[PDB]
Amino acid sequence: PLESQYQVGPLLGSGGFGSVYSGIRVSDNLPVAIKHVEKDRISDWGELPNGTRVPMEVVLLKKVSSGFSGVIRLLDWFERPDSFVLILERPEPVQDLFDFITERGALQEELARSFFWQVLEAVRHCHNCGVLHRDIKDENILIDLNRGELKLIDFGSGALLKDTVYTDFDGTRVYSPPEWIRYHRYHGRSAAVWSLGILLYDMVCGDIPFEHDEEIIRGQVFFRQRVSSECQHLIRWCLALRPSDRPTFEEIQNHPWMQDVLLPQETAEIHLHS
């Protein structure tokens, strides 16, 4: 074992998530992402079923890794004196949703429907596993371009799912709900639905709807692109000011705009040119 198991390629990126390198597993040529997180830079810690002290990110990733391909899976992890190394799966070719939107602008509704539906299934999987991502946004969504499959990344600001109030939030501000801005308090599910509202607007308009605190609190949504009445309704419902007025995941998926979604492979053939 140790670090004989992987061949380290080029740097893919770095930021609040750490430093991530392209990699290959020598056991079977499998593409992987090798993410290094410094110990002195993590605030949230937890324990694994085995009973070890690891970054919360690892706890959460282990809980959501398995069968479902809607989340980038943790294949293994290692501990070093000053850091933790995470071996994640690496689809290829791939592009994150932020870059995808920057390049193509506002997405056609058929495409946004397929993408949004997949994000919903991924978030449901997380929540079923007892995990709350807390930073759902375009930058944290990877598109497997050949299969048309979306994958959720970066659980570094996540938390165990609970039914009581959360008083901490280290996720992206502009995707944060009015109740966090005004009271420094939110519940998991309704805060997640707010972020999904921001994400859907972003997909169909090419940018997020709110820039400033005052705009988030006012909750008035202006559309900069042509968007169907049904899509506008769903977005406005997800962005309801009162947490209890937002839809549940089931209500989102049963909404008229969400019906007749394309399959991932279909989405890729029609829109990603597979």
Side-chain angles (χ1 to χ4, degrees), residues 78-105:
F78 294 83
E79 183 178 335
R80 283 169 164 188
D82 291 335
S83 71
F84 279 91
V85 183
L86 279 58
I87 307 297
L88 300 155
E89 88 196 313
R90 180 172 56 84
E92 284 300 310
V94 75
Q95 190 178 47
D96 70 46
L97 184 54
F98 178 91
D99 290 340
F100 185 79
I101 289 168
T102 291
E103 286 190 9
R104 293 162 65 129

Short mmCIF file of all heavy atoms in Angstrom, two decimals, residues 78-105:
data_model
loop_
_atom_site.label_atom_id
_atom_site.label_comp_id
_atom_site.label_asym_id
_atom_site.label_seq_id
_atom_site.Cartn_x
_atom_site.Cartn_y
_atom_site.Cartn_z
N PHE A 78 -6.47 8.17 2.63
CA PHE A 78 -5.21 7.96 3.35
C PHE A 78 -4.98 9.10 4.32
O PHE A 78 -5.42 10.22 4.09
CB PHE A 78 -4.05 7.94 2.36
CG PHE A 78 -4.08 6.78 1.42
CD1 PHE A 78 -4.86 6.81 0.28
CD2 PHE A 78 -3.29 5.65 1.66
CE1 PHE A 78 -4.88 5.74 -0.59
CE2 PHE A 78 -3.30 4.57 0.79
CZ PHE A 78 -4.11 4.62 -0.34
N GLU A 79 -4.28 8.81 5.41
CA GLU A 79 -3.92 9.84 6.36
C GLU A 79 -2.40 10.04 6.36
O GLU A 79 -1.64 9.08 6.28
CB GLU A 79 -4.39 9.49 7.77
CG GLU A 79 -4.10 10.60 8.77
CD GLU A 79 -4.60 10.31 10.17
OE1 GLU A 79 -5.57 9.53 10.34
OE2 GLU A 79 -4.03 10.88 11.11
N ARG A 80 -2.00 11.31 6.42
CA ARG A 80 -0.61 11.73 6.50
C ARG A 80 -0.46 12.64 7.72
O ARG A 80 -1.47 13.11 8.25
CB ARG A 80 -0.24 12.51 5.24
CG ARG A 80 0.00 11.63 4.04
CD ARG A 80 0.10 12.39 2.73
NE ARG A 80 0.68 11.57 1.69
CZ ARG A 80 1.03 12.00 0.49
NH1 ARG A 80 0.85 13.27 0.14
NH2 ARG A 80 1.58 11.16 -0.38
N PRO A 81 0.77 12.91 8.17
CA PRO A 81 0.97 13.76 9.35
C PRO A 81 0.27 15.12 9.28
O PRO A 81 -0.34 15.53 10.27
CB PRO A 81 2.50 13.91 9.43
CG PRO A 81 3.05 12.69 8.75
CD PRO A 81 2.05 12.40 7.64
N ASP A 82 0.30 15.80 8.13
CA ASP A 82 -0.33 17.11 8.02
C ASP A 82 -1.55 17.20 7.12
O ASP A 82 -2.11 18.29 6.97
CB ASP A 82 0.71 18.12 7.54
CG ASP A 82 1.75 18.39 8.58
OD1 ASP A 82 1.53 18.24 9.80
OD2 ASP A 82 2.88 18.78 8.20
N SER A 83 -2.00 16.09 6.55
CA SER A 83 -3.13 16.11 5.62
C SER A 83 -3.85 14.77 5.46
O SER A 83 -3.42 13.76 6.00
CB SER A 83 -2.60 16.50 4.24
OG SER A 83 -1.82 15.44 3.69
N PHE A 84 -4.94 14.80 4.70
CA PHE A 84 -5.70 13.61 4.32
C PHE A 84 -5.75 13.59 2.80
O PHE A 84 -5.94 14.63 2.18
CB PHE A 84 -7.13 13.65 4.87
CG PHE A 84 -7.25 13.23 6.31
CD1 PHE A 84 -7.17 14.17 7.33
CD2 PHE A 84 -7.48 11.90 6.64
CE1 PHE A 84 -7.28 13.77 8.67
CE2 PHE A 84 -7.59 11.50 7.97
CZ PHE A 84 -7.49 12.45 8.99
N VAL A 85 -5.59 12.41 2.21
CA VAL A 85 -5.65 12.26 0.76
C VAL A 85 -6.88 11.42 0.44
O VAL A 85 -7.07 10.34 1.01
CB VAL A 85 -4.38 11.58 0.21
CG1 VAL A 85 -4.42 11.50 -1.30
CG2 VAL A 85 -3.12 12.31 0.69
N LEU A 86 -7.72 11.92 -0.46
CA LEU A 86 -8.97 11.27 -0.84
C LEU A 86 -8.87 10.80 -2.28
O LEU A 86 -8.49 11.57 -3.17
CB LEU A 86 -10.14 12.26 -0.71
CG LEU A 86 -10.76 12.49 0.67
CD1 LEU A 86 -9.76 12.99 1.69
CD2 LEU A 86 -11.91 13.47 0.56
N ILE A 87 -9.21 9.54 -2.53
CA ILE A 87 -9.19 9.01 -3.88
C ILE A 87 -10.63 8.97 -4.33
O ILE A 87 -11.45 8.22 -3.78
CB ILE A 87 -8.56 7.60 -3.94
CG1 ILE A 87 -7.18 7.56 -3.28
CG2 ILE A 87 -8.47 7.13 -5.39
CD1 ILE A 87 -6.12 8.45 -3.95
N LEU A 88 -10.95 9.79 -5.32
CA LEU A 88 -12.30 9.90 -5.83
C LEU A 88 -12.36 9.38 -7.25
O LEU A 88 -11.33 9.25 -7.91
CB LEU A 88 -12.73 11.36 -5.80
CG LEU A 88 -12.73 12.00 -4.41
CD1 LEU A 88 -12.57 13.51 -4.53
CD2 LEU A 88 -14.02 11.66 -3.70
N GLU A 89 -13.56 9.08 -7.73
CA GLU A 89 -13.67 8.58 -9.10
C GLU A 89 -13.57 9.77 -10.07
O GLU A 89 -13.81 10.92 -9.69
CB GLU A 89 -14.89 7.63 -9.27
CG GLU A 89 -16.23 8.23 -9.61
CD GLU A 89 -17.38 7.25 -9.35
OE1 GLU A 89 -17.32 6.07 -9.74
OE2 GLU A 89 -18.37 7.67 -8.73
N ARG A 90 -13.09 9.51 -11.28
CA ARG A 90 -12.90 10.57 -12.25
C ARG A 90 -13.49 10.19 -13.60
O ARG A 90 -12.85 9.47 -14.37
CB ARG A 90 -11.40 10.90 -12.39
CG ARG A 90 -11.09 12.02 -13.38
CD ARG A 90 -9.63 12.49 -13.40
NE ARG A 90 -8.65 11.42 -13.65
CZ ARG A 90 -8.30 10.97 -14.85
NH1 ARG A 90 -8.86 11.48 -15.95
NH2 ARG A 90 -7.40 10.01 -14.97
N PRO A 91 -14.71 10.63 -13.89
CA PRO A 91 -15.32 10.40 -15.20
C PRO A 91 -14.54 11.15 -16.28
O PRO A 91 -13.88 12.15 -15.95
CB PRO A 91 -16.73 10.98 -15.05
CG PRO A 91 -16.93 11.21 -13.59
CD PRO A 91 -15.59 11.40 -12.99
N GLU A 92 -14.58 10.69 -17.53
CA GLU A 92 -13.84 11.33 -18.62
C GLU A 92 -14.47 11.08 -20.00
O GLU A 92 -14.71 9.93 -20.35
CB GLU A 92 -12.41 10.79 -18.67
CG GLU A 92 -11.49 11.34 -17.59
CD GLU A 92 -11.33 12.85 -17.65
OE1 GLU A 92 -11.05 13.37 -18.77
OE2 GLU A 92 -11.47 13.51 -16.60
N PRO A 93 -14.71 12.13 -20.81
CA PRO A 93 -14.40 13.53 -20.48
C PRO A 93 -15.46 14.15 -19.59
O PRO A 93 -16.61 13.70 -19.54
CB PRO A 93 -14.37 14.22 -21.85
CG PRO A 93 -15.25 13.41 -22.72
CD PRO A 93 -15.30 12.01 -22.15
N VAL A 94 -15.08 15.24 -18.95
CA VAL A 94 -15.92 15.86 -17.96
C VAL A 94 -15.83 17.40 -17.96
O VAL A 94 -14.82 17.96 -18.35
CB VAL A 94 -15.50 15.25 -16.59
CG1 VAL A 94 -14.15 15.85 -16.11
CG2 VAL A 94 -16.54 15.40 -15.58
N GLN A 95 -16.92 18.06 -17.57
CA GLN A 95 -16.94 19.53 -17.42
C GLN A 95 -17.92 19.89 -16.32
O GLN A 95 -19.00 19.28 -16.24
CB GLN A 95 -17.35 20.24 -18.72
CG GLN A 95 -17.16 21.77 -18.69
CD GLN A 95 -17.54 22.42 -20.00
OE1 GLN A 95 -18.59 22.13 -20.57
NE2 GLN A 95 -16.68 23.31 -20.49
N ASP A 96 -17.57 20.84 -15.46
CA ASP A 96 -18.52 21.22 -14.41
C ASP A 96 -19.60 22.12 -14.99
O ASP A 96 -19.43 22.70 -16.07
CB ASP A 96 -17.85 21.76 -13.13
CG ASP A 96 -17.23 23.10 -13.28
OD1 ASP A 96 -17.86 24.00 -13.86
OD2 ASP A 96 -16.10 23.36 -12.83
N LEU A 97 -20.72 22.21 -14.28
CA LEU A 97 -21.87 22.91 -14.79
C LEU A 97 -21.60 24.41 -14.93
O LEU A 97 -22.08 25.02 -15.85
CB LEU A 97 -23.09 22.62 -13.91
CG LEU A 97 -24.43 23.20 -14.35
CD1 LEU A 97 -24.78 22.82 -15.78
CD2 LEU A 97 -25.51 22.74 -13.39
N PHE A 98 -20.81 24.99 -14.04
CA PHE A 98 -20.46 26.40 -14.15
C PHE A 98 -19.80 26.68 -15.50
O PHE A 98 -20.22 27.57 -16.23
CB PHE A 98 -19.49 26.81 -13.04
CG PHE A 98 -19.05 28.25 -13.10
CD1 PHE A 98 -19.75 29.24 -12.42
CD2 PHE A 98 -17.93 28.63 -13.85
CE1 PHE A 98 -19.34 30.59 -12.48
CE2 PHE A 98 -17.50 29.97 -13.92
CZ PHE A 98 -18.22 30.94 -13.24
N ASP A 99 -18.77 25.91 -15.83
CA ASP A 99 -18.04 26.10 -17.08
C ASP A 99 -18.95 25.82 -18.27
O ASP A 99 -18.86 26.49 -19.29
CB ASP A 99 -16.81 25.19 -17.16
CG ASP A 99 -15.71 25.59 -16.19
OD1 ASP A 99 -15.71 26.75 -15.72
OD2 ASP A 99 -14.82 24.80 -15.82
N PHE A 100 -19.83 24.83 -18.12
CA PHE A 100 -20.75 24.46 -19.19
C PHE A 100 -21.67 25.64 -19.52
O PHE A 100 -21.87 25.98 -20.68
CB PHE A 100 -21.56 23.24 -18.77
CG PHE A 100 -22.45 22.70 -19.84
CD1 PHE A 100 -21.94 21.91 -20.85
CD2 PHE A 100 -23.81 22.96 -19.83
CE1 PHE A 100 -22.77 21.39 -21.84
CE2 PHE A 100 -24.65 22.46 -20.81
CZ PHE A 100 -24.13 21.67 -21.81
N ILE A 101 -22.19 26.28 -18.48
CA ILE A 101 -23.10 27.42 -18.66
C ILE A 101 -22.34 28.65 -19.21
O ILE A 101 -22.83 29.34 -20.10
CB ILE A 101 -23.86 27.72 -17.35
CG1 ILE A 101 -24.87 26.61 -17.09
CG2 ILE A 101 -24.58 29.10 -17.38
CD1 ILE A 101 -25.45 26.62 -15.71
N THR A 102 -21.14 28.90 -18.68
CA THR A 102 -20.31 30.01 -19.14
C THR A 102 -20.08 29.92 -20.64
O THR A 102 -20.10 30.93 -21.35
CB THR A 102 -18.95 30.00 -18.41
OG1 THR A 102 -19.14 30.33 -17.03
CG2 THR A 102 -18.02 31.10 -18.93
N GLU A 103 -19.87 28.71 -21.13
CA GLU A 103 -19.59 28.47 -22.53
C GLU A 103 -20.81 28.53 -23.43
O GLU A 103 -20.75 29.06 -24.54
CB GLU A 103 -18.95 27.10 -22.72
CG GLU A 103 -17.50 27.03 -22.27
CD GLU A 103 -16.83 25.73 -22.68
OE1 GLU A 103 -17.45 24.96 -23.47
OE2 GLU A 103 -15.69 25.49 -22.22
N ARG A 104 -21.92 27.97 -22.97
CA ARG A 104 -23.11 27.87 -23.82
C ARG A 104 -24.23 28.82 -23.48
O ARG A 104 -25.17 28.95 -24.25
CB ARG A 104 -23.61 26.43 -23.78
CG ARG A 104 -22.62 25.49 -24.45
CD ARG A 104 -22.82 24.06 -24.09
NE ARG A 104 -24.11 23.61 -24.59
CZ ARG A 104 -24.31 22.51 -25.32
NH1 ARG A 104 -23.29 21.71 -25.64
NH2 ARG A 104 -25.55 22.20 -25.71
N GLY A 105 -24.11 29.51 -22.36
CA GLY A 105 -25.14 30.42 -21.91
C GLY A 105 -26.34 29.64 -21.40
O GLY A 105 -26.26 28.42 -21.18
#
